[PDB]
């Protein structure tokens with residue numbers, strides 16, 4: 001029926017790998033700038049080599065995993081769309097920073113998408129934005145966005161840029 005940005009909904013919970021455990025996943029901003037009350041927009045390097053800034057999305061720090069969970073029961077979600085990448089605001093000091101093992105989209109406990117298959121070496125600061133367009137099973141109740149930091153969480157500014165559902169209904 002219409003597109004509904006995930007950042008325009010409330011999550012059930014949203015964990016992240018940051019050292020400051022009272023920081024929170026950010027709506028429409030990358031994680032660290034967002035928590036620092038900066039206006040900085042989410043931005044990624046695209047396949048065509050340009051940097052795109054996004055109006056909407058989610059910013060987290062990858063964890064073991066970081067898990068952002070939505071109740072989509074009754075909402076008639078048929079599609080999930082997002083770009084995935086490390087936000088340009090991350091500081092890629094060296095190979096140890098901004099290195100994410102994988103990102104998964106999970107629906108009612110089942111992984112329906114993982115970067116691991118096309119991205120066997122994970123994501124890093126140089127990885128171009130990953131375009132994800134997914135069919136969502138009918139009558140689904142829970143959708144989770146999981147990002148896996150691997151060895152360390154340093155610089156793992158994971159953003160789900162322009163993350164939105166196609167949905168028929170009202171959300172809980």
Ligand SMILES: [Ca+2]
Pocket residue numbers: 062096097098099100101148149150151152153154156
């Ligand atoms: Ca990492």
